[PDB]
């Protein structure tokens, strides 16, 4: 929907995973941003062809079903009912609970989803996500998001997202941000630790 930037920043030699998260939240409170609640993105893989059957708490009705690289079905509940019936064409492939859990913040129609990355129970990362509401068209407001990133991150300021290479002049889609989230999951699942 709105243009989103997704990245990781590590512990960065300060205490623990959540210490830098609390530093970012107290920086945002110095700016003075109000909250809108929490958020969590959960993933789960399937295979016979890797099926990413995956969910987000921002849109719980949106059940994302992706290939490894093909089309994405942002489908409803009855698709999840149909998905159970195969069980031989597409095996369960359990133990894929790579999730991002955190809170959302608002500052004058600006939204931030900030939290930590866990492999189920054990947290081994920090997810950083910035976004803006009325960003309809993509690749036209990246100066705004870059300014917002350098405003309060300081170190570990990211840039040039992977879906920005998917250049098109239409409306930015939630699939782009979602793609960014699964690329984030691919970035974090390699190190484990």
């Amino acid at each position: 929907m709105g243009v989103t930037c997704v990245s990781q920043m590590p512990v960065a030699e300060g205490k623990s995973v959540q210490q830098t998260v609390e530093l970012l939240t107290r920086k945002l409170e110095m700016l003075g941003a109000e909250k809108q609640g929490t958020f969590c993105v959960d993933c789960e893989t399937y295979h016979t062809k890797l099926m990413y059957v995956m969910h987000n708490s921002e849109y719980p009705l949106s059940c994302f079903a992706l290939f490894e690289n093909g089309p994405c079905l942002i489908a409803d509940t009855n698709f999840d009912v149909l998905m159970v019936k195969l069980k031989g064409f597409f095996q369960s492939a359990k133990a894929s609970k790579i999730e991002t859990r955190g809170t959302r913040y608002q500052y004058c129609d600006f939204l931030v989803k900030v939290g930590t990355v866990t492999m189920g129970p054990s947290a081994r990362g920090i997810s950083v996500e910035v976004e803006y509401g009325p960003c309809v068209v993509a690749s036209d407001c990246w100066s705004l998001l870059l300014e917002f990133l350098q405003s309060f991150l300081g170190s570990h300021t990211p840039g040039a997202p992977a879906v920005f290479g998917n250049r098109h002049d239409a409306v930015y889609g939630p699939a782009d941000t979602m793609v960014q989230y699964m690329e984030l999951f691919n970035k974090i699942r390699k190190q484990q630790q």
Partner: peptide, 13 residues
């Protein structure tokens, strides 16, 4: 019966 409605990405899939 299982009844789901999906867009024009049905036929090519």
């Amino acid at each position: 019966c299982v009844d789901i409605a999906t867009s024009e990405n049905l036929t090519d899939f």
